[PDB]
């Protein structure tokens, strides 16, 4: 059921913070309805990247991605940027029409930078706006720090759980920070 | 007086949407206190770019920036990326310490992309987070559309006027879309 009011949540992992030097190594997406009810969980895909690219990762990235097991999944992966892009679009097309949903998540500005460069078609599937939960978090700690005590993220490596946590964060802000 | 709670608002103009192919042609900044009171407005600088660079602009861009007179300002400008970056930094350093303020404005995710590539020192001066007012506009439209009618923007070619309206918009949401 593709509804124009549905929201696309995304979360990527990368070899580094530089779009021109680094690459996407993992992608995960999920769709909620306008009211944040999770409707469908898309595929979590380790994006294959060469051994030379992986050798370029800085100290902290190599540690985090090797420790989570992502490095192994990336090497065993048979899906590069385009293949992972296509599967993600195939999933999204069934839940949200193109150009309708802003990109949703926490600090998704950095993620969109990589989409622009390596997954242009998926990037264009989003509405141009950004729906960054961290923006509300920033405003909450500046104008109502109280609410930040009532919600605490556990932290995880699993891409999807990370996203569900972003959805929960925004749902918290909707009830106790936003004035509906 | 630099205060760790002050917010840095910024608005750029570019020759196009592609950071690797386009360039910054205008930059304007403003600083507000934690409560959105404008403390100081920085310099509005047309950033010089070569005639060739300007020839790589698309139809929509060349038309918009030519009519506004920005193209003439660019050609005459004696301040390239670095020098415009230095001037912006001298201004900001007097009102906000480094790494404290997220980047603020409307859809500034796109602006930050250009700062990462052409003004990295300025980019690093911001806290890594984004304070995109358009994120609140998007939520208001989906959860409490009634308040939308009560706010309107004139539309202008003056960068500072755009930033002041962004500030006002956020102030509007703080009053009609946020709980004290």
Q: Which residue of B has its CA nearest to A112?
A: B109
CB contact at 8 A, A20 and B20: yes
Q: Which of A20, A10, A87 is nearest to A48 (CA)?
A: A87
Cβ–Cβ below 8 Å for B109 and A109: yes
Q: Which residue of A has its CA nearest to B139?
A: A131
Q: What does the DSSP 8-state code read for residue A146?
A: T
The two tokens of residue B35 are 């409560």
Length of chain B: 180
The two tokens of residue B113 are 């992309």
**Domains of chain B, first to last:** 1-180 (3.30.420.10)
CB contact at 8 A, B13 and B70: yes
Q: Give the 3-state secondary structure of residue B105.
A: strand
* Strand pairing category for B24-32 and B45-46: antiparallel
Distance (Å, whole) CA B98 – CA B127 = 8
Residues of A within 8 A of B107 (CB-CB) are 128-130
Which of A14, A102, A136 to probe the B interface (max B CBs under 10 A)?
A102
Q: Which of B133, B97, B153 is nearest to B10 (CA)?
A: B133
Nearest to A135 among B113, B130, B179 (CB): B130
Q: Catalytic site residue A118?
A: no
Resolution in A: 2.2
Q: Experimental technique used?
A: X-ray
DSSP assignments along A71-129, one per residue: HHHHHH----HHHHHHHHHHHHTTTS-TT-SPEEESSHHHHHHHHHHH-HHHHHHS-S-
Question: What's the first-to-final CA gap in chain A, in angstroms?
Answer: 27
Residues of B within 8 A of A171 (CB-CB) are none
Residues of A within 8 A of B37 (CB-CB) are none
Distance (Å, whole) CA A153 – CA A172 = 11
């Amino acid at each position: 059921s593709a509804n124009e009011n549905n929201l696309i949540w995304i979360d990527l992992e990368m070899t580094g913070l530089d779009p021109e030097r680094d690459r996407i190594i993992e992608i995960a997406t999920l769709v909620t309805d306008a009211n944040l009810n999770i409707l469908a969980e898309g595929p979590t895909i380790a994006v294959h990247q060469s051994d030379e690219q992986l050798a370029l990762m800085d100290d902290w990235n190599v540690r985090t991605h090797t420790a989570s097991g992502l490095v192994e999944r990336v090497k065993a992966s048979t899906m590069g940027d385009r293949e992972a892009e296509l599967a993600t679009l195939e999933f999204l097309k069934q839940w949200v029409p193109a150009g309708k949903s802003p990109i949703c998540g926490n600090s998704i500005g950095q993620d969109r930078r990589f989409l622009f460069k390596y997954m242009p078609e998926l990037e264009a599937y989003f509405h141009y706006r950004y729906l960054d939960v961290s923006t509300l978090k920033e405003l909450a700690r500046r104008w109502k720090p109280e609410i930040l005590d009532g919600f605490t993220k556990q932290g995880t490596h699993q891409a999807m759980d990370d996203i569900r946590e972003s959805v929960a964060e925004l749902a918290y802000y909707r009830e106790h920070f936003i004035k509906l």
